[model samples]
Target: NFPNSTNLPRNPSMADYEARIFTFGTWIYSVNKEQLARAGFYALGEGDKVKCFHCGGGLTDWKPSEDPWEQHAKWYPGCKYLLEQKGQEYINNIHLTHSLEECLVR
Candidate 1:
């Protein structure tokens, strides 16, 4: 469970990175919000600039598109994205967000 970054938005000192590892970056956005908001995260900002799910990659740029939704559907096949099953929950609870770099870094 390599943290890979010291700039973690919340719980930077967290030592139990197993959940962070087992779930990978996929669930961090979700679980962290509940934890962070309680710690006073009013806004998560726009776009993906946080951590990465695949390969624990980090963000390097920002660009919006309607492509990756279908791309994930195509590429990851059986995985259940938080966006699909629980849209708003994905928005508020989990940061089900992405950027070209986050995707490309993987």
Candidate 2:
């Protein structure tokens, strides 16, 4: 197996950007719905929970300052679509920031 592989979404039907965004009807969230779709997420129509169409990863309780891709790479670092689109450099920064925050607490 390749060390890095771009895994396809569990729900390929929601793979399209527009399709994913449409899933957010009757929705209000702290994170921009459009940005979430752009980052491969669609609302669960259940609270703030949203799952990545690419990685099948789910996240919620978004902070105001949290960004879509940053949280994406933060929570689901192994997400291949994240790796492909945002790249390792971006993931590194997200992780680095997370590490620094941990250091601050310790």
Deviating ranges (above 4 Å) for candidate 2 = 1-6
TM-score of 1: 0.20
Query: For candidate 1, lDDT tens digit of each residue in 41-97?
Result: 222233433332321323312233323333323233222231343344434422234
Off by over 4 Å in 1: 1-66, 86-106
Query: Residue 27's C-alpha lDDT in candidate 2?
Result: 62
How far is each candidate from the true structure, as Cα RMSD in Å?
13.0, 3.3
Per-model C-alpha lDDT, please? 0.32, 0.84
Residue pair clashes in candidate 1: 30-94
The prediction achieving the highest TM-score against the true structure is 2
Residue-by-residue lDDT tens digits, candidate 2, 1-81: 222235766778888999997899966677788988899898888898998887788888987788999988888888888
Give model 1 RMSD, 1 decimal: 13.0
TM-score of each: 0.20, 0.89
The per-residue C-alpha lDDT of model 1 at residue 40 equals: 19
